[PDB]
């Protein structure tokens, strides 16, 4: 009876979602004029990676950026001057994520070794040493983001997302309920809530304080590789392997807009937003990044010049630059 | 134009560039090998023979050639999502045990281990990320296989095998069955070796297969192949 009850409750939630929706967003966004062609030229060409780059995180000052590669190096860069600020040797070469702290003191990394390493940058010795090694994940870490200098939220391949007390070294809040590994996560600007998408084609809103699942969205055909918040904190565009990008509203509890185009059949690796949030920039497997518009739902620009597949994409805090991560071991900054 | 601190920062960046180029030159010579198979196949035994959570990395040097072996058996997560990381690998070491055919799988006891190993080899061999990567196949527990094949026939697990009860015939037939699973035989070699209590022969076989892969890579670089 309970198993049939779950299907009936899901049907009731579907009926409530259909009942709430009255007007399509594409009909409402017809009024605003199109942005037009948006041309961005590369400003800097960054080198020093001899291996496949998987992740990059922007600094809050908009000048510093970290990069994760398979040569065993986390390299912290100076975007303006093209200098290498730090070069962090890694114990485990297989790394899939890297985070930069909001204060700028710490740098995280994680991958197939199931260990999250926190690196101190403002030490008096002058060498970037390991401060804390987080352990206890049965699956490969796929994403990590600093809430604070003492708190960090990590996603793993054991279907468990945890909140880590860096000073204590143990986990405070455990999040469960994702069928399948959680590919990524993003932090809201208020930092009170985060949403993580997994490989069961679902993205679940989470509450750091409460520790329980707030909302769940099931608008994706296959699986979620990427997820990024909107600047206000009420919406989040999502990237998937079915060559689609979807926008979900927390308050409306339904799918706002769908981004797709017939010739592109490749999956989406990463998504990001500009300062205003008008431009949706995504990363694809067809070696070319495409810029989308939040309201108009068209293509505003095309980024090319990456020889190998685009691993990651991040727009800086003030919105002055965009650096794209590719597998050809070059990070290119687009203004 | 540049200030004194900007000049010293550029000099620091050039010293970091020298260290990164030196570490990349060291990493380019080193051979990476991927270890695959079931948990009870005998990965730990063959790793200990070659030496004498997360990813287990083994470093050993044979005939002035550096080897990296990555054991991925500890992870419980879905393999399809992290399999693309291992694209640039020299060879795949796939280890199974010959005595697995009578021992039924622990999980629900509804499928023979040998056929699960066939599906395990089929998913790795036909993977889109591994098209030109050769597979070094190891068949473990051959002495137990000889005893088991003397006591119990191979016909009971599947009726398709109609050959006479012989150790050499059954071993060669299982080898042929693993070879048949390859769907791209021209661009992918399968190196099959029966493992034994002699430590030297396994490391030698691995060096011969890696040497043939480096010959293939050098010929592709020259453009003759």
């Amino acid at each position, epitope marked *: 009876q309970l198993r049939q009850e779950a299907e009936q409750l899901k049907n009731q939630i579907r009926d409530a979602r259909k009942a709430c929706a009255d007007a399509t967003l594409s009909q409402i966004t017809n009024n605003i004029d199109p942005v037009g062609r948006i041309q961005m030229r590369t400003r800097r060409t960054l080198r020093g990676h001899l291996a496949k780059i998987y992740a990059m995180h922007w600094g809050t000052d908009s000048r510093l950026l970290v990069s994760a590669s398979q040569d065993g190096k986390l390299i912290i860069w100076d975007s303006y001057t093209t200098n290498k600020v730090h070069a962090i040797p890694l114990r485990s070469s297989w790394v899939m994520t890297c985070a930069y702290a909001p204060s700028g003191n710490y740098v995280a990394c994680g991958g197939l070794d199931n260990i999250c390493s926190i690196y101190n940058l403002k030490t008096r010795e002058g060498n970037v040493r390991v401060s804390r090694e987080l352990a206890g994940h049965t699956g490969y870490l796929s994403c990590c983001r600093f809430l604070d200098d003492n708190q960090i939220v990590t996603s793993s391949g054991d279907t468990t997302c945890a909140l880590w007390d860096i000073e204590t070294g143990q986990q405070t809040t455990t999040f469960t309920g994702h069928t399948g590994d959680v590919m990524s996560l993003s932090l809201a600007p208020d930092t009170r809530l985060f949403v993580s998408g997994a490989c069961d084609a679902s993205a679940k809103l989470w509450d750091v304080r409460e520790g329980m699942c707030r909302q769940t969205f099931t608008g994706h055909e296959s699986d979620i590789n990427a997820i990024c918040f909107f600047p206000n904190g009420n919406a989040f565009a999502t990237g998937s392997d079915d060559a689609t990008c979807r926008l979900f509203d927390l308050r409306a509890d339904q799918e706002l807009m769908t981004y797709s185009h017939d010739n592109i059949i490749c999956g989406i690796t990463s998504v990001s937003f500009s300062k205003s949030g008008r431009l949706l920039l995504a990363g694809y497997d067809d070696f070319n990044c495409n810029v989308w518009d939040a309201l108009k739902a068209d293509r505003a620009g095309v980024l090319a010049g990456h020889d190998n597949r685009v691993s990651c994409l991040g727009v800086t805090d003030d919105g002055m630059a965009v650096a794209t991560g590719s597998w050809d071991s070059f990070l290119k900054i687009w203004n | 134009t540049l200030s004194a601190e900007d000049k010293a*920062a550029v000099e620091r960046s050039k010293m970091i560039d020298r260290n990164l180029r030196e570490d990349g030159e060291k990493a380019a010579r080193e051979v990476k090998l991927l270890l695959l198979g079931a948990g009870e196949s005998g990965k730990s035994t063959i790793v200990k023979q070659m030496k004498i959570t997360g990813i287990v990395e083994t470093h050993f040097t044979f005939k002035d050639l550096h080897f990296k072996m990555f054991d991925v058996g500890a992870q419980r997560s879905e393999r399809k999502k992290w399999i693309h990381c291992f694209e640039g690998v020299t060879a795949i070491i796939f280890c199974v045990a010959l005595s697995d055919y009578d021992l039924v799988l622990a999980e629900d006891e509804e499928m023979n281990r040998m056929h699960e190993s066939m599906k395990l080899f089929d998913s790795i061999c036909n993977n889109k990320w591994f098209t030109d990567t050769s597979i070094i196949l190891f068949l473990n527990k051959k002495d137990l296989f000889e005893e088991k094949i003397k006591k119990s026939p191979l016909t009971i697990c599947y009726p398709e095998y109609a050959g006479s009860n012989t150790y050499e015939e059954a071993a060669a037939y299982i080898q042929c069955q693993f070879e048949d699973l390859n769907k791209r035989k021209d661009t992918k070699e399968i190196y099959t070796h029966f493992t034994c209590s002699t430590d030297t022969k396994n490391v030698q076989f691995v060096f011969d297969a890696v040497t043939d892969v480096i010959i293939k890579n050098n010929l592709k670089d020259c453009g003759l192949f």
Partner: single-chain antibody, 231 residues
Framework: VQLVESGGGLVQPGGSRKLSCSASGFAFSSFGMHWVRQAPEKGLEWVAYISSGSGTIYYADTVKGRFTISRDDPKNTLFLQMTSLRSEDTAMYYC??????????????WGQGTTLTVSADIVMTQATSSVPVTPGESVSISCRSSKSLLHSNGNTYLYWFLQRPGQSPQLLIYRMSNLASGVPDRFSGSGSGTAFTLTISRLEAEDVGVYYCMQHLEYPLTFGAGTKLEL
């Protein structure tokens, strides 16, 4: 982190002496090293610099040629070679570690100083020489330069030091926008090109000392005269 100097004592004029400074508790190979000299009844003065990896070497114009600087990274020892010493070299020599990147704090750690007694250009201008102050009131210290230190990248290369009597000097404020690590919020730097101001709110007895303004726009490094406070 510790730097100690050895090789002092009395030296005859025209002779030679080789100093050695040993480093402990930090990666010696990554820091550039400064020599700073101090006369007994005058302010500090810069001597020489060697970069990390010995890539570039700078000297002051008054000490060019006679002094030779080297460093050995596997033994973590800084060597100063002195040839044909004169009567003006009667000073205490300090070792300074300075890392250079965006956001770094160079001149943060100072040595202890070895005494050497011998027996026979941007000009930084301290307008005042001594100001009697009381603990509790705000104290204003002014420094001036001969050249505008405002570089086109936005950084103003003025560093503020405090040398407590009988102790090694410490960094207070670097680049005029940033406080040094370990310095309280009592110190604050303000001003613009050619006119700088230092303010000390909630004066303390430990704050009492000699204050130096240092430019770092171009070599050779030239220091200030040194504003001393008293009670």
């Amino acid at each position: 982190v510790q730097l100690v100097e050895s090789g002092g004592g009395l030296v005859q004029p025209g002779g030679s002496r080789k100093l050695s400074c040993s480093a402990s508790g930090f990666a010696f190979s990554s820091f550039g090293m400064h020599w700073v000299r101090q006369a007994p009844e005058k302010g500090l003065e810069w001597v020489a610099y060697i970069s990390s990896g010995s890539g570039t070497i700078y000297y002051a114009d008054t000490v060019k040629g006679r002094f030779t600087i080297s460093r050995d990274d596997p033994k973590n020892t800084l060597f100063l070679q002195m040839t044909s010493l004169r009567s003006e070299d009667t000073a205490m020599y300090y070792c300074v570690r300075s890392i250079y990147y965006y956001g770094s704090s160079p001149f943060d750690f100072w040595g202890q100083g070895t005494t050497l007694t011998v027996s026979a250009d941007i000009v930084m201008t301290q307008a005042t020489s001594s100001v009697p102050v009381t603990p509790g009131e705000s104290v204003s210290i002014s420094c001036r330069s001969s050249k505008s230190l405002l570089h086109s990248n936005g950084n103003t290369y003025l560093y503020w030091f405090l040398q407590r009597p009988g102790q090694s000097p410490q960094l207070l404020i670097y680049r005029m926008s940033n406080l040094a690590s370990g310095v309280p919020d009592r110190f604050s730097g303000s001003g613009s090109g050619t006119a700088f101001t230092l303010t000390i709110s909630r004066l303390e007895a430990e704050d009492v000392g000699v204050y130096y303004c240092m430019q770092h726009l171009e070599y050779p490094l030239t220091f200030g005269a040194g504003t001393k406070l008293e009670l």
